[PDB]
Design a protein around this nucleic acid. Structure first.
Ligand SMILES: Cc1ncnc2c1c(I)cn2[C@@H]1O[C@H](COP(=O)(O)OP(=O)(O)OP(=O)(O)O)[C@@H](O)[C@@H]1F
Ligand SMILES: [Mg+2]
Ligand SMILES: [Mg+2]
Ligand SMILES: [Mg+2]
Lengths: 117, 929, 73, 132
RNA sequence: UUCAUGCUACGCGUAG
RNA sequence: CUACGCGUAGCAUG
């Protein structure tokens, strides 16, 4: 009975590792691996430069005007276009109902989602 | 007088400057400058009276008072010739404040003056003392320093809690405005040390001879040697200035291009991790003549004291280098074709750049050990997960692992109404009664988990004083000599709670039982030897705790992943089970309060202290604001037992495993990894023991600071005078462990500052005559050391002092105490707060423990914890235990009634007759069992 | 007391609200726990009762949740 | 006899656990309104009786000296119970009315509220007010 | 929904 | 009859 439990957690770890290797980018990641002069790259620069998408969680309207202004914003020296804005209730928020007037009506914080351009 | 107005003319001299006669026309007694001296009368870093100075003050155009003074020393001619001999060999260096030597007839004698030029109002030692011996009422010198250097206007000080770091963290910005002032002083120290090397003069450099502009002055205590061979002794200088170098962040200007504060940040190559060349460049720029070998990467270290030494410098030097450089180091390995990207390294902020050495390129299979190392790695999770810009925190986010952010809410407590009706029917909670519900389950909103994660912003880079830390690490390890530690093999690890969650991602597949039962003992031993050779980074799924509190703050539990627990247990559990089974030591973790244990605790603290008071304290944000240096110092003290079972590189990779799994770590706070700037994970193995070593380090550092804060001229005792003198010797003058003096200072702090520590809360029993003189620590010394080392302010409100021993600690482990009588002996009984016990009765975290008749053993344990309330002089408190007793009575009555109504009458009734009888609860405090 | 049973009433009131899935609205639940955590940290009685009025009104805004017509008797 | 003791006590523990788990919602609401009727505050019983006969607020009852309160009024006898002129007696504080919105969302004035217009009014009434 | 400690309550194994 | 280990539950402390 114990070795079946070992077998299922081996299969689950191999499954999640293989799915998360086919989830990660292999063009920008291989570019920054081969750019590394010794092949060794800090981990907290892997998602900053090879992200599929960005999530910005915005607590109030002031930090929304300072970062995710409009429909296309810049973070991490790259151009991100706002693919979606979702509030704290996991409900969709379109870009027109975010304003200084409507900011007491939004379920803050807002989870905007942006793809890399 | 003509004499004073002629002297004020002569001190001007060649450099034309309008002056105002500060002080009087003779030499001016200063108002207590702090000094750093060692000569045959005194020793230490204290406040003295500089009586020989004749301080002046410059006047500019239109008569304004400037921060530019002429300290005029009157000293002997046999020193004056020596002064001019040295200054004529340091005259071209720009880090020497000019000196203007002459002699002048104050009484008709031509007494020689050293009429120095353009020094500030204060010296560096006043800044270091004021920021380091910080007293919330007496901090006038710190206010003058922050005002005269434009760090904040004088109306900043009327703010409530202007000095605190926990409230008002804009004081970090106010202090950081001194950062270029301190850095410019460090550059002047290196110019001065270069010039006094090249002039070949030898002497110790103390903080008190350097002003705030940087310019060094005092040229006694210097001896001339051959030029090119001179050496300056800057161990006390740089050591005493080390907490200020990150309190005021003196190396933020190193993170600019050309190191100019107007110019932009350095756009570092975002792939560059190995900053070893820039670390050595910083150390050759600032700490140049610091004559102990600095290793940037701490893998090249020679023992534990060298790890603390070199990690102390990397804590300062890693504030320059960008936070996208630290954390793990990943390399795209290949397993059987498919490309992994796993972490084969770690760039610690403290332990340098640490590379793994069992790195496998081109693996063909993965065993269970290697799957744990690769899944517990943050490498996969931050590579596959998508980027996060979290504006809720200041803490540096890295990634996010779900498509959306999970919000965690803490429920309210399932209110036990039956006990509350039984509490008001037996007469509690009336008007004005002193036992009212102050303890509740405070419910939380969605963003509470991240708002409580963000309390790691209280943590900071802390460059500890390294000579103090390298002596108090020896005194702390002298407090841990009664224990036996070492590596245990996988079959010797006793795990008490197997059915607990095993961290991320391992709680997506089972509990910790799954991994201790799936792995064989050889797999666990091989994983522990992997960590003996390799750093592995991990994840703490930082979840919210659902517990009774008297405050509305959410409490987080940082449940570390099982690759951290099942190796920290094998590395540390022999020392932890030895501390948890050694009675009567300083550290009382494992000593039961029952069975007369609290009384033996208290009579062990009272072990022959001469004029014994008591004193407690509490660390504000101990888990969040503990520095990195003190947590790796505590991991080293817990790893000084491995002198036979480990090598030294084994001890370094196991320290770096503990640092990458506990201290600086990828932490998952609601579906999205962040970097944790330090502190302690509370789900750590050694979380009550490294907290305890931290606690002894703060206590011993308070005693070292207090014994060197005293004059030494003003100590009538001479044994503690010649123990202060060898304290300054063994601290700032001797490299190796002077073990005779470490034994003496440990015997001193077991005599006069006897201690008791169950991990965060401490009760000492200090000799109050010495703390009245300052020869052990008062509360003001703990407040100062908490301020400059732990980076928080510890108020006088949360620190007590019980004068009479007979009333014991006011609180230890949130247990008050009393002195009551049983069997012709006055024993100590520990009693809780009565609101806590009534809040635990009235409010239950589950609904199953409300009316499912499980409550018997609940209220039996609450009444075991609430028996010593019945010996209290307040009958209102004393009715709490009888409330629980009659409530267990009513519970057993309704239990037998419902069991008779269901099937039949009970027969084993005499097992429960002891439950509503206080025979059972008094026998939990009689010391015979 | 009055203080003690208004604190216990706020505890059982927010347990009723959390039973009726007010966690799903983030703003309304943040208001509910702000009212509750200001009740339990209250040393005055009248301001505890006015925030109790506010929190119970947040319960009573849900029409089809609690059948108050049959539950008062 | 001995083994059956632990058997019947474990089955009784599971039975009482499922007994408390099953009626977790309805008994808690009866217990809530039990200790609400035990409180006997005039503001609290005001809110409970107004929500009894139908007068139900639509938001949070505020604490500001001037803030907005939406509340349903079903019919006219409750309107006579709560509205005397331009005021609105509710939660033991005076609420000053400022507009009344009917069922088809039109601003309705105070002057046309009487017995004769009440069968022509689109009930319920969504009024709004400010605290005194 | 963590780590470490202590104590209860409930069923077992060992010895005297 | 007694103490010591084991498993579960519960409570308190850090
Ligand atoms: C491992 C672990 N597991 C669960 N709980 C833990 C720990 C550890 I290590 C500390 N604790 C908690 O510490 C609280 C009291 O201390 P407390 O809440 O007052 O800390 P603090 O907020 O920094 O102090 P201040 O109030 O002055 O700010 C108390 O519930 C509990 F002990
Ligand atoms: Mg708390
Ligand atoms: Mg505190
Ligand atoms: Mg507190």
């Amino acid at each position: 009975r114990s070795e079946d439990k070992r077998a299922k957690v081996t299969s689950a770890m191999q499954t999640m590792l293989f799915t998360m290797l086919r989830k990660l980018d292999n063009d920008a990641l291989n570019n920054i691996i081969n750019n590394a002069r010794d092949g060794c790259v800090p981990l907290n620069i892997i998602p900053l430069t090879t992200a599929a998408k960005l999530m910005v969680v915005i607590p109030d309207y002031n930090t929304y005007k300072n970062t995710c202004d409009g429909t296309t914003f810049t973070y991490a020296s790259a151009l991100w276009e706002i693919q979606q804005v979702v509030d704290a209730d996991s409900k969709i928020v379109q870009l027109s109902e975010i304003s200084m007037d409507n900011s007491p009506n939004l379920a803050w914080p807002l989870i905007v989602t942006a793809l890399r351009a | 007088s003509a004499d004073a107005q002629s002297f004020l003319n002569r001190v001007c001299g060649v450099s034309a400057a309008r002056l105002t006669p500060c002080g009087t026309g003779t030499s001016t007694d200063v108002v207590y400058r702090a000094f750093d001296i060692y000569n045959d009368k005194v020793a230490g870093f204290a406040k003295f009276l500089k009586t020989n100075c004749c301080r002046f003050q410059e006047k500019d155009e239109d008569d304004n008072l400037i921060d530019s003074y002429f300290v005029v020393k009157r000293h002997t001619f046999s020193n004056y010739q020596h002064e001019e001999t040295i200054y004529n060999l340091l005259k071209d260096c720009p880090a020497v404040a000019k000196h203007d030597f002459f002699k002048f007839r104050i009484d008709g004698d031509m007494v020689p003056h050293i009429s120095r030029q353009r020094l500030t109002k204060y010296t560096m030692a006043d800044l270091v003392y004021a920021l380091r011996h910080f007293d919330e009422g007496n901090c006038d010198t710190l206010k003058e320093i922050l005002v005269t250097y434009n760090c904040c206007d004088d109306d900043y000080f009327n703010k409530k809690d202007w000095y605190d770091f926990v409230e008002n963290p804009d004081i970090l910005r106010v202090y950081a405005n001194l950062g270029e002032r301190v850095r410019q002083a460090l550059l002047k120290t290196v110019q001065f040390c270069d010039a006094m090397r090249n002039a070949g003069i030898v002497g110790v450099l103390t903080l008190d001879n350097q002003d705030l502009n940087g310019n060094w002055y005092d040229f006694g205590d210097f001896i001339q040697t051959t030029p090119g061979s001179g050496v300056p002794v800057v161990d006390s200088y740089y050591s005493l200035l080390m907490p200020i170098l990150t309190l005021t962040r003196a190396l933020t200007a190193e993170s600019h291009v050309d190191t100019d504060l107007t110019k932009p940040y350095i756009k570092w190559d975002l792939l560059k991790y190995d900053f070893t060349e820039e670390r050595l460049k910083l150390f050759d720029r600032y700490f140049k003549y610091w004559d102990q070998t600095y290793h940037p990467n701490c893998v090249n270290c020679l023992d534990d004291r060298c790890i603390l030494h070199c990690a102390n410098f990397n804590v300062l030097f890693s504030t320059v280098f960008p936070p996208t450089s630290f954390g793990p180091l990943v390399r795209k390995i290949f397993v059987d074709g498919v490309p992994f990207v796993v972490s084969t390294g770690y760039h610690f902020r403290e332990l340098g750049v640490v590379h793994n050495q069992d790195v496998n390129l081109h693996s063909s299979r993965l065993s269970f050990k290697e799957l744990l190392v690769y899944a517990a790695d943050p490498a996969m999770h931050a590579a596959s997960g998508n980027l996060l810009l979290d504006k809720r925190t200041t803490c540096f986010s890295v990634a996010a692992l779900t498509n959306n952010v999970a919000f965690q809410t803490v429920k309210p407590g399932n209110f036990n109404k039956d006990f509350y009706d039984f509490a008001v029917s037996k007469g509690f909670f009336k008007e004005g009664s002193s036992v009212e519900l102050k303890h509740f389950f405070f419910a939380q909103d969605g963003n509470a988990a991240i708002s409580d994660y963000d309390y790691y912003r209280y943590n900071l880079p802390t460059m500890c004083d390294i000579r103090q830390l390298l002596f108090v690490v020896e005194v702390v390890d002298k407090y841990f000599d009664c224990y036996d530690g070492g590596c245990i093999n996988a079959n010797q690890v006793i795990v008490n709670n197997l059915d607990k969650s095993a961290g991320f991602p391992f709680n997506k597949w089972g509990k910790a039982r799954l991994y201790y039962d799936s792995m064989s003992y050889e797999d666990q031993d091989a994983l522990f030897a992997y960590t003996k050779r390799n750093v592995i980074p991990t994840i703490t799924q930082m979840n919210l705790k659902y517990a009774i509190s008297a405050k509305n703050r959410a409490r987080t539990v940082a449940g570390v992943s099982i690759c951290s627990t099942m190796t920290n247990r094998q590395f540390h559990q022999k020392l932890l089970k030895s501390i948890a089974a050694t009675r009567g030591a300083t550290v009382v973790i494992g000593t039961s309060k029952f069975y007369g244990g609290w009384h033996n605790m208290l009579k062990t603290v009272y072990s022959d202290v001469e004029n014994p008071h008591l004193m407690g304290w509490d660390y504000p944000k101990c888990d969040r604001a503990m520095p990195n240096m003190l947590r790796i110092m505590a991991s080293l003290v817990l790893a000084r037992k491995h002198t036979t079972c480990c090598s030294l590189s084994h001890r370094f990779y196991r320290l770096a495993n503990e640092c990458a799994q506990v201290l600086s770590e990828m932490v998952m706070c609601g579906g999205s990894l962040y970097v944790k700037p330090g502190g302690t994970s509370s789900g750590d193995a050694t979380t009550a023991y490294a907290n305890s070593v931290f606690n002894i380090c703060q206590a011993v550092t308070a005693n070292v600071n207090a014994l060197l804060s005293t004059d030494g001229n003003k100590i009538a005792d001479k044994y503690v005078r010649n123990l202060q003198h060898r304290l300054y010797e063994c601290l700032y003058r001797n490299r190796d462990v002077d073990t005779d003096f470490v034994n003496e200072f440990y015997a001193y702090l077991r005599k006069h500052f006897s201690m008791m520590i169950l991990s965060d809360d401490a009760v000492v029993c200090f000799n109050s005559t010495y703390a009245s003189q300052g020869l052990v620590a008062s509360i003001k010394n703990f407040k100062s050391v908490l301020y400059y080392q732990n980076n928080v302010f510890m108020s006088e409100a949360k620190c007590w002092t019980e004068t009479d021993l007979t009333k014991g600690p006011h609180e230890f482990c949130s247990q008050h105490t009393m002195l009551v009588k049983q069997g012709d002996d006055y024993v100590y009984l520990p009693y809780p707060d009565p609101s806590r016990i009534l809040g635990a009765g009235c409010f239950v975290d589950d609904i199953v423990k409300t009316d499912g008749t499980l409550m018997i053993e609940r209220f039996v344990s609450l009444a075991i914890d609430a028996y010593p309330l019945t010996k209290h002089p307040n009958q209102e408190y004393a009715d709490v235990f009888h409330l629980y007793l009659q409530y267990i009575r009513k519970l057993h009555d309704e239990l037998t009634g419902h069991m008779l109504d269901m099937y039949s009458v009970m027969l084993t009734n005499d097992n429960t007759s002891r439950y509503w009888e206080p025979e059972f609860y008094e026998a939990m405090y009689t010391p015979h069992t | 007391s009055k203080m003690s049973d208004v604190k216990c009433t706020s505890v059982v009131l927010l347990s009723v609200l959390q039973q009726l899935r007010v966690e799903s609205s983030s703003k309304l639940w943040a208001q509910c726990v702000q009212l509750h955590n200001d009740i339990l940290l209250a040393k005055d009685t009248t301001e505890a009762f006015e925030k109790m009025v506010s929190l119970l009104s947040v319960l009573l805004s849900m029409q089809g949740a609690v059948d108050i017509n049959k539950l008062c008797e």
